[model samples]
Target: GSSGSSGLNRDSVPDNHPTKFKVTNVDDEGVELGSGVMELTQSELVLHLHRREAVRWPYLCLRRYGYDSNLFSFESGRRCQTGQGIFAFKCSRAEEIFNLLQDLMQCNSINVMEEPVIITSGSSGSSGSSGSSGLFRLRHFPCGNVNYGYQQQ
Candidate 1:
């Protein structure tokens, strides 16, 4: 039987289903560096190499990610001790995985701009204009006003 859930909104869901793909790390010249299992999740992309520690790259930190035929690649935004570099992988289902990742990234992008705070400047006090001036003055020159107040007294 199929996995059950239907007509679910991709964005509204807290966690999307993770996918794993057998991948081989490739260098700039397309030489194989190592073989690993790559996991694609809503939060990040994880790599599990044979007899080695796993590496993770969050979607937000990934740049220039694309796929062609059996090749997939991306550059990490993070700077390492060794310096930042593009990471390439050879996967049989590159196009499919790339499309899924692209969709997830798009969903992530949409959530970036959230509702910001509405600054109600003159709404809280007895005097309308005084509240706004007070708020601005207090915020912009806290120390200056305190010294000025003491000097005035």
Candidate 2:
């Protein structure tokens, strides 16, 4: 009874591996804004935010993938950097998150979120550490853990 969709592996698979090839930003009435893409594989989920931009996560390294009714989050690595350091992805929808989780589960199953992820309004009304309006979040881990505590629901 899984509602997940499989991801794509570009390096080994054909060009058709990608899904949602022309992703875009939409308003409540379904108006379009900027465009992007979402790429996936059995091991990784890459978000093409725009031209020459993307983020990937190694499934085994991922610790949490959760979503509220609106916000979706992908958290990888330990506070101590387990597989290949920590990485994070935050989006505003479910379909996008589920598509990648479907294929990622094939490598090593990480349970999908069945609940809401409440984000406390930051003092400045910004999203996470950055002031970008909650379109999406891509956090790259360097070498050390500063304990950002971003996965709080």
Candidate 3:
């Protein structure tokens, strides 16, 4: 299980578009909860608060020198490989998630232009072959916003 976030302070809003964000401890409502003053432009992207902590069992001390672990486990020994953390947002609305992710990827520092956010629904946090369904996938590029929009096979 993970923790909730709180009190995110937006340092600057460029032309009314949210620019700098010092975020953490997001709440159940998806509001960021923290007080960390941050000024960033690029390469400062830290996907989610989940990254700060190593998600390995204290006993196992898994790979990466125990500096590894994921928000959700997917196997007896493997975790989902998003390769990044994400803002702890409790939003269920697609549009809202899209906007937040868009800003995080563009304004903050996350450069997922080449790496898109993949959406998988209802897996027991088990193996790769677990029962899961793909609702849609989102890929963003610096060249454009939300390239390939919502796609599915």
Residues 44-143, candidate 1: write the lDDT tens digits.
Answer: 7667665645667666655445676677766555443222445667776776677777666666534333344454343344322332110011111111
lDDT of 1 at 138: 17
On TM-score, the leading prediction is: 1
Ranking by lDDT: 1, 2, 3
TM-score versus the correct structure, for each prediction: 0.54, 0.38, 0.25
Model 2: lowest-lDDT 10 consecutive positions: 141-150
- TM-score between model 1 and native: 0.54
How much is the lDDT of residue 82 in candidate 1?
A: 20
Candidate 2 lDDT score relative to the true structure: 0.44
lDDT of 3 by residue, 1-153 (tens): 677564575545432234334333343243445433222233322222332432222111111111012111111113333322222322223233334433433553323335545763543453233234211111211111222221223
Model 1 lowest lDDT segment of ten: 142-151
- RMSD values, in order shown: 22.4, 11.2, 14.4
lDDT of each: 0.54, 0.44, 0.28
Compose the digit string of candidate 2's lDDT tens values, residues 66-101. Answer: 544433344566422223222332234444555456
Give the per-residue Cα lDDT of candidate 2 at 87: 30
Decreasing TM-score order of the candidates: 1, 2, 3
